[PDB]
């Protein structure tokens, strides 16, 4: 149950792009904060396309269930604006944006320790979700937000958060699902209702591949028909050039969902690289 924010208290600024049936804007929220102090707070605004209003339930159910669990590695949702014909998610604005964009622009200055630290943090967030038996369902580098850059001057590591999952793959059209191979697992291509905790272990593997690959998209050279055939022939992703996490990636991207390792075991493996 989300706090309702008045349209009057939001200003829309620049477009930040679009997601699946959504438009993204940087914005500002006027609000009374602690001690009654007035604030104008930078916010991330996620607007459901007016033409796809039928998706609003899934749009908001995702963000809602995760926002019931507070955690340092999970994005903060302030509330929702449902004034007028709008369906707007009002979210904390993370200073350095999405991880995939960040990896591409910083490819030639991100070392293995940075990748391992970000992987550990992501695994911590997924461990927390697994303990709470809560499925994310759309783990990917675009849904990882970089709160803070690494600072070698103080040894401060980077700090990331996992964003909301957006519209569930259980209600999206099959062609969007096919294009999201290989983040969407084989069993969910076979049947979207196979969405399960084991889904998030597979997509975590794909996300590690992104992190280790300077933001390349795995299988981007394959069209949708060939992505399906990739799964039909039981292929695995190539090892990234920085190959240190390749075995972990493949262990997570196991075609047998019951064989995919728990996030506790994943965390132990990450720690053993040191
Ligand atoms: N909290 C927040 N936020 C931001 O900006 C985002 C907007 C949207 C998203 N999240 C998505 O864009 N999610 C996609 C996923 C699509 C997908 C998933 C798996 C495989 C293929 C494709 C979607 O829903 O379409 C992430 C960051 C920014 C940008 C600067 N600062 C920010 N702070």
Domain boundaries in the chain? 1-93, 94-274
Q: Is 118 within 8 Å of 53 (Cβ atoms)? A: no
CA distance 218 to 165: 20
Gap from CA of 233 to ligand 1 centroid (Å) = 30
Enter the tokens of residue 103.
């990896």
Q: Is 183 within 8 Å of 155 (Cβ atoms)? A: no
In degrees and rounded to multiples of 5, residue 142 shows phi and psi of -60, -25
Q: Which atom of ligand 1 is nearest to the CA of 98?
A: 27
Helices and strands (H, E) in the chain, number of each type: 9, 7
In degrees and rounded to multiples of 5, residue 110 shows phi and psi of -120, 115
| Experimental technique for the deposited model | X-ray
Gap from CA of 98 to ligand 1 centroid (Å) = 7
Gap from CA of 274 to ligand 1 centroid (Å) = 30
Q: What's this structure's resolution in Å?
A: 2.1
Q: Which atom of ligand 1 is nearest to the CA of 183?
A: 20
Q: Is 48 within 8 Å of 56 (Cβ atoms)? A: yes
Q: Is 10 within 8 Å of 29 (Cβ atoms)? A: yes
């Amino acid at each position: 149950v989300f706090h309702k924010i008045r349209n009057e208290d939001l200003i829309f600024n620049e477009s930040l792009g679009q997601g699946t049936f959504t438009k993204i804007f940087k914005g500002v929220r006027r609000e009374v904060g602690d001690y009654g102090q007035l604030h104008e707070t930078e916010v991330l605004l996620k607007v459901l396309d007016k033409a796809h209003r039928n998706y609003s339930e899934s749009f908001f159910e995702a963000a809602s269930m995760m926002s019931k669990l507070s955690h340092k590695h999970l994005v903060l949702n302030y509330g929702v604006c449902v004034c007028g014909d709008e369906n707007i998610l009002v979210q904390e604005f993370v200073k350095f944006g999405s991880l995939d964009t960040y990896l591409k622009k910083n490819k030639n200055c991100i070392n293995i320790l940075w990748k391992l630290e970000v992987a550990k943090q992501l695994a911590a967030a997924m461990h927390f979700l697994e303990e709470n038996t809560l499925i994310h369902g759309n783990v990917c580098a675009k849904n990882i937000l970089l709160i803070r850059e690494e600072d070698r001057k103080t040894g401060n590591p980077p700090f990331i958060k996992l964003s909301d999952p957006g519209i569930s793959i259980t209600v999206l059209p099959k062609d969007i699902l096919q294009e999201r191979i290989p983040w969407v697992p084989p069993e969910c291509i076979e049947n979207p209702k196979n969405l399960n905790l084991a889904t998030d272990k597979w997509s975590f593997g794909t996300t590690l591949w992104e992190i280790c690959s300077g933001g390349d998209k795995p299988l981007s050279a394959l069209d949708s028909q060939r992505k399906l055939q990739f799964y039909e022939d039981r292929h695995q992703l190539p090892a990234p050039k920085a190959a240190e996490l390749a075995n972990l990636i493949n262990n997570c991207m196991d075609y047998e969902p019951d064989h995919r390792p728990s996030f506790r075991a994943i965390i132990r493996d990450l720690n053993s690289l040191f």
